[PDB]
Every structure is written in C-alpha cells, then in structure tokens.
Amino acid sequence: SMHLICQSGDVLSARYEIVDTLGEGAFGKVVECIDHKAGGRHVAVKIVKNVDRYCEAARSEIQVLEHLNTTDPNSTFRCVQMLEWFEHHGHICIVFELLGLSTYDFIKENGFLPFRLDHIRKMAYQICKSVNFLHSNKLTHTDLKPENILFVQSDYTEAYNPKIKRDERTLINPDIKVVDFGSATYDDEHHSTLVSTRHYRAPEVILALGWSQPCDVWSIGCILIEYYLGFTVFPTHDSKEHLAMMERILGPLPKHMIQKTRKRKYFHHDRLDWDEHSSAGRYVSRACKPLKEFMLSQDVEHERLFDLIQKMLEYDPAKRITLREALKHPFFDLLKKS
Ligand SMILES: O=C1N=Cc2ccc3c(-c4cccc(O)c4)c[nH]c3c21
Ligand SMILES: [Cl-]
Ligand code: NA
Numbered sequence: 001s002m003h004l005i006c007q008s009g010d011v012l013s014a015r016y017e018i019v020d021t022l023g024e025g026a027f028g029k030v031v032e033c034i035d036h037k038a039g040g041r042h043v044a045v046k047i048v049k050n051v052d053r054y055c056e057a058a059r060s061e062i063q064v065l066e067h068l069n070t071t072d073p074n075s076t077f078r079c080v081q082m083l084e085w086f087e088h089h090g091h092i093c094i095v096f097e098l099l100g101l102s103t104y105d106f107i108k109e110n111g112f113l114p115f116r117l118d119h120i121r122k123m124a125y126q127i128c129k130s131v132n133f134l135h136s137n138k139l140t141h142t143d144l145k146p147e148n149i150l151f152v153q154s155d156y157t158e159a160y161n162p163k164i165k166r167d168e169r170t171l172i173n174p175d176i177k178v179v180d181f182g183s184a185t186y187d188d189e190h191h192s193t194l195v196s197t198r199h200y201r202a203p204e205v206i207l208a209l210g211w212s213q214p215c216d217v218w219s220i221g222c223i224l225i226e227y228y229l230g231f232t233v234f235p236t237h238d239s240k241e242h243l244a245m246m247e248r249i250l251g252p253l254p255k256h257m258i259q260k261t262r263k264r265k266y267f268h269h270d271r272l273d274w275d276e277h278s279s280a281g282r283y284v285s286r287a288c289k290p291l292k293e294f295m296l297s298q299d300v301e302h303e304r305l306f307d308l309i310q311k312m313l314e315y316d317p318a319k320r321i322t323l324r325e326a327l328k329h330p331f332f333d334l335l336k337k338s
Helices: 052-071 103-109 117-136 214-229 239-250 255-260 279-287 300-312 330-336
Strands: 016-025 028-035 041-048 082-088 091-097 149-151 156-161 166-171 176-178
Touching: 016 041, 028 091, 041 052, 052 082, 052 091, 103 149, 103 166, 103 214, 117 176, 117 214, 117 300, 117 330, 214 300, 239 279, 300 330
Parallel strands: none
Antiparallel strands: 016 028, 028 041, 041 091, 082 091, 149 176, 156 166
C-alpha cells in the first residue's frame, strides 16, 4: 500500500533514507534518499505501486535501462542512469541518479510561463540526440512529455519582466536527461494498441495504423510547442476532438490514412464525423488556429523553430522527419557555430 511506505525517515533496503518526495504519477512515487552505503550520495528512488500493470512496466523499464546504460556508460546520450533495483514490502523500487525538476514542474512553478528560445534550442537538441540514441537501438520511447524530461540541475534566477508584467524564472543551465522507460518498446516486441499520453499522441497511434519510432518525433514536436507557449495546442481529453484540433492546426488528414484506418468511429464517409456547432466544436474553433499563428515573433530564429515543429508534425509517419535529420535542421546551426 503506497501511502504506508513512502515517508521521510523511512529506510529502504537497509541503506536508502527518505528525505523528500520528488514526484508522484500513475505508477507510484519518486522519493529522494540518502544512500548510506555510497558515502551519503543523494539518489532518486521510484517506488512502484503493487499493481499488475505498473509492476510489468517497472520490470520492463529495468531491462531497458540495463541495456541503455551498458550501451552508453558515460551517459553521452542523456538517458537517466539506473543504479540498482530492489523490492520493499513487495514493491519494486528502482534507484536512479538524482536529477532536478522535470520540465513540466519547472514550467508549473514558473506560473506556466514558457522557456526562452535559446533554452528551447539547447533542450530540443539534447532531447533529439537522446531519443535518437533510443531509435538507433531498436527502441521507441512512446511516452515522451515534459514530465519525462528532467533538468540535470534546475537552479534559476528570477526577475520582473515588465514586457509581460510578471516575475520570471530563468534556468542557469538547461541541460536535460530523459526518464521513464516503462513504455519503451523494441522493434520486434508486441506493440500496444494505444500509446502515449493524449496530448503527445501521434495520428497513426490514434488511427491504429501501426506505430514505430516516428510517433516519438510527433511527441517531441508537441513538447517543443508546449515549451514555446507554456501550454498545449491540443487541450483535450477526447480522441475525436484531438483529431479535430489537428485538422484546424495542421490542415486535413491525408486521404490515405483515412482510407486505411479501422477507426471508423471517427469518420463519416471520408471526413471527420465532427459537428462544428456543438460545444466541443465551438471550443475547437475558439481554441485552435493554424500552427504558425501561434508564433510570438517573426524573427528568423522563430521561423526556424516553427519550420522544424511543422516537419515533426507531418501526419504521414514515413514522410515525417527523423531525429537524425532533425539534428541537422537549421534551427540548431546556432549551437554548432565555432
Ligand atoms: O531525479 C530523478 N531521477 C530519476 C527520476 C525519475 C522521476 C522523477 C520525478 C517525477 C516523477 C513523477 C512526476 C513528477 O512530476 C516528477 C522527479 N524526479 C525524478 C527523478
Ligand atoms: Cl535559429
Ligand atoms: Na463512422
């Protein structure tokens, strides 16, 4: 029972003393501990609910991390390092290096203000390089979202911004790592019918056309929008509504994808089965507009970012830019300047 076992001062595995709670998700909790058998190092321990599906995900996460961490022992590609795992009162507990705030929690604590463009550029490059390393190893993450991208160290400076009448926090160092490999799937493994957290889910996933590495690229494009704006451009908890928002932001779905899909519930003949005058229809009309209308500036660096996002949000997953190609996009040139 999760509440019974996650308390400050509790000691796990005769070595890890809980000092704080770092996060809680569907899966259980992540706590910060002092490791009394590694010289007092502070670590993060993910305590998994004793529930079938979360236990299975944790076991899978341990297998993937063992692979990724052995393949990349210097963490050149920025996947979180797993230190060990154990069981505590029947719960699986995974020990990680300690990181800073998730990118989501940073934005939340900053009043849902967005990141500045130079930080987005650096973060995007590192996200793309890390996930590309997964892709090179026959893996797809499937659950990329701001909560699963963590700052290495989230110290900030703070200043009033009169341009927007608000106190603003700015990272000192925006370096990141990628976490949460409990949904990561190898190319030759069973692919779950549904993947991703809704706001980051690709159209081939929604339409059950089959998914692979490209679905991670879509999620990354969605994450970059959220970093740029401070909010999602897909504010919905309904699949058909999500497709409608895609249409308004990105244009009509390709005919071949509507042709091929078994998800007939979404469609009336060859068009989305969508009433523009319903409550949901009025909201999508208010809340969505073409992608480039969300730009905050027409400066060329903003145009470069939006060009990349647009490529990442290509509907056809084969046509969609790969991460190897994304790393070569002009948006990143500023990082490669001598
Ligand atoms: O320092 C870390 N090293 C590995 C790791 C994994 C997850 C987390 C979260 C977290 C988890 C769920 C929700 C949330 O908002 C934050 C915070 N710190 C984490 C670490
Ligand atoms: Cl640029
Ligand atoms: Na239908």
